[PDB]
Amino acid sequence: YDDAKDVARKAWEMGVSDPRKIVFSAKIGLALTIVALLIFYQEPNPDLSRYSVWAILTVVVVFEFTIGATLSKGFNRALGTLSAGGLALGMAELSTLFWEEIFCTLSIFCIGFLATFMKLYPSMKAYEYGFRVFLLTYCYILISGFRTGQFIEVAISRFLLIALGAGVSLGVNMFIYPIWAGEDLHNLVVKNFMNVATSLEGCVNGYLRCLDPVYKGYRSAVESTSQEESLMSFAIWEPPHGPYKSFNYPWKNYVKLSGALKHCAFTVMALHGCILSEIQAPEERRQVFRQELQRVGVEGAKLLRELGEKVKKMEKLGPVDLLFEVHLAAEELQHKIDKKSYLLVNTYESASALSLATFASLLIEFVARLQNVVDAFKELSQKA
Amino acid sequence: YDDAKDVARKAWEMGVSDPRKIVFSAKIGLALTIVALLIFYQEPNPDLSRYSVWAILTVVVVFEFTIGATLSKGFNRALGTLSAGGLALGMAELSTLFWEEIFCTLSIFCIGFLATFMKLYPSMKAYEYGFRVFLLTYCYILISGFRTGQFIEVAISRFLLIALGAGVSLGVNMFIYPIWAGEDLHNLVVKNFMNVATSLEGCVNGYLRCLDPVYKGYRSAVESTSQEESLMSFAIWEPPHGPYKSFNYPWKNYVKLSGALKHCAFTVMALHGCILSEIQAPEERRQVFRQELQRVGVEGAKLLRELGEKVKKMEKLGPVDLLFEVHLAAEELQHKIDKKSYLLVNTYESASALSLATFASLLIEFVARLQNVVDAFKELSQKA
């Protein structure tokens, strides 16, 4: 019973935090019950209601979270289905022309074999639903057409059914509280700034706290380029929905600003590795560089926090001279290790000392990786 | 025409290199044409051939690359379909009992809404096909059952059709040249050793070559734990297929040995970052530590190469005292920087000079991360 409390809590916790799941499930439920209500109350005549399941099963099979996703995946499945339709109907008139059972058997071996590879090819890894709905539509059309004499009228009826289902699908998805895929990416390029500034602050302050929240911080930023590169495929399909003024919005720098950041979060990786490493500097020697090591972590996060606030607001005003206090912090960090360098050099009696030299110069590097981002965001600030 | 040559080459190159795609497409083609041949030549009577498309569309919808995947995903879809069947038939006898159009409309809004969340919950992210085939089977059964009087005989017929399709599906997938998901993971835990030993050798030898192949090396090992954790879900479903002697084979250390390796390939990340960093040691100063820096990279790869050859062979003989020459190499590397330490310490005139403190003590660390793996593989060598 206590475990079941969490399951209810899990739904509530993901619910109250993000009111985008409840609304999506409400939208799909509404679409399904509207199709069913239309079937039962407005089309009760059995003259032709069998195919009425096309109508409710197409709403279920083509309704997805983001307008871009629904629209592009509908386009790909429509190309697969219509290509199978044209090619299969050509093969169907042929396959009635005189040994047609054997010809129509080979005509499905060939399609299965050819479509399988282009499904399995490494490049076409996300265009897999298209190959499934093409291999699975060739087969259906071909069997039904070998069975029936004049298929094309029933094919016309099936298309208006899968246009009466998908019509309501797209309409309800786009008009009733839409969920775009453009601002699912503008709210993601600005999320990584927030969970990297803490990863920087976690790794600078976890190194010294003596006498994981960090591991979930920076691994989200790094593991998003495989995602933002998808949300860049979905983002091109939406209209200029609101602030995103014109068509051809540069959803190419949001994977470039998140590119220079994910490249700047490859020191915070090794910056964390120094605290997880089996060799690390002793407590008493870390706490001689306490100020400057904290000084970079303190100010270094403040900039990278408000670099996000320059994306969330997408402030068409400017990032003017951001890195002065991090440069000063890094410069006098190095000049601070110029005096107390004997704590870094003369087996293991010197392998542990010297890992304190490895953090100090994995943190100055992060200061240098931080000039690349501001330029990779200065292009995005102006032209976008 | 020249670009089209590559497309043919791409299929051939992925074909001749891996003869696992051609055989899979041949298997799916054979299944589809056998179902079609069975329909046309052995069941030509139209007394009942409409549902004969269940038979060919179920082979297409449930045939997958690995026996484990086909079998587990068939089990999940069967649970979804049979659960929708039992619950929907209960709702169907009720939904004929006396305002049943409105009750049967609400009975599909409720199912859509409830199933949407458990599809969208973060945990149930791979169990998404199950929720789609449950939401999409409740709907079909319920519409058809509201339409027809005594559905259960037609439901029995549909189940023997989707047992005459899936029967041939599983049979052809398992008997005609099977493709397991256990040895798709034993051949993957041993692949990461081969593309990390080169990443180590690339980053040690790319640092010095003056007077990307590495970036594809270690990023494959790190980006596989999200994959090997799936191949651990598929691996439990196969029988003891061959060498994997008994049931309950420990496919839990292959994600633990590949866990200690992916944890050892987090220095080779930062080891590479030092050559991509905007601050790096000068040429003339790198080539004073040329021998020992190469010495660790040379011998350090030789061990990690033959750690794989202790997995590919899965040699039930032993990894006896592997790390002696890497320990000596790391020990006298540190003792080599004990003499020539003035090249590491006394703004930027010393930020570049101390980048050698950070390669040499990002490479001694990799030697220490390498004791964890041999222990995390000594457990796997004995009990597996």
Curated annotation (Swiss-Prot), chains A, B:
The keyword Zinc does not apply. GO terms for cellular component: plant-type vacuole membrane. Disruption phenotype: No visible phenotype. Slow activation by external aluminum. Keywords: Chloride, Ion channel, Ion transport, Membrane, Transmembrane, Transmembrane helix, Transport, Vacuole. The keyword Ubl conjugation does not apply. One of its GO terms (biological process) is malate transport. This is Aluminum-activated malate transporter 9. Disulfide bonds: none annotated. Expressed in hypocotyls, leaves, roots, flowers, sepals and stamina. In leaves, expressed almost exclusively in mesophyll cells. The chain crosses the membrane at residues 22-42, 51-71, 78-98, 102-122, 126-146, 159-179. It is found in: Vacuole membrane. It comes from the Eukaryota. It comes from Arabidopsis thaliana. It is a multi-pass membrane protein. GO terms for molecular function: monoatomic anion channel activity. Vacuolar malate channel. Has a higher selectivity for malate than for fumarate. Also exhibits a weak chloride conductance.
